[PDB]
Amino acid sequence: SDKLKEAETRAEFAERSVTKLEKSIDDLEDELYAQKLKYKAISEELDHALNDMTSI
Amino acid sequence: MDAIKKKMQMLKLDKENALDRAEQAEADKKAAEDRSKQLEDELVSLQKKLKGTED
């Protein structure tokens, strides 16, 4: 019974830790999505300036 | 970006104004030279008429 309690406690902590890690990776994935949007927008704006200047 | 576009627009406004002024000056030169040459032809005809009167 004592060993079962110990193992259950460690497994519960492991579940909590993996939940925290999954939330953290979600946050960082969202941040990378935002920065990818930033690069898309800046490249699009540079292309717009290029086409405006080449087309006067 | 942002300032680059505005600077390009300034460089284009200068382009349009300079080109328009050049074209207008060229038209002015054409008109003025045509005026001068027609006056010279009138002068020539007057010389010939004077010659006939002298005869």
Which residues, including other chains, have CB under 8 Å from residue A1's CB and lie 6 or more apart?
A: none
For the record, the structure tokens of A3 come out as: 């060993």
Direct distance between the N- and C-terminal alpha carbons of chain A, in angstroms, rounded to an integer: 81
**Whether A52 and B5 lie within 8 Å, measured CB to CB:** yes
Distance CA B9, CA B14 (A): 9
Establish if B12 touches chain A: CB-CB under 8 angstroms.
yes
Which residues, including other chains, have CB under 8 Å from residue B8's CB and lie 6 or more apart?
A: A49, A52, A53
Query: Which residue do the tokens 């002298």 mark?
Result: B54
The residue among A55, A36, A32, A33 whose CA lies nearest residue A44 is A36
Angle formed at CA A54 by CA A52 and CA A55, multiple of 5 degrees: 60
Amino acid symbol at B13: L
Half-sphere exposure of residue A33: CA atoms within 13 angstroms, side-chain side? 6
Check if the beta carbon of residue A49 is closer than 8 Å to that of residue B1.
yes
Distance CA A33, CA A44 (A): 16
Distance CA B45, CA B53 (A): 12
Check if the beta carbon of residue B3 is closer than 8 Å to that of residue A50.
no
Check if the beta carbon of residue B11 is closer than 8 Å to that of residue A55.
no
Residues of chain A contacting B5 with CB distance shorter than 8 Å = 49, 52
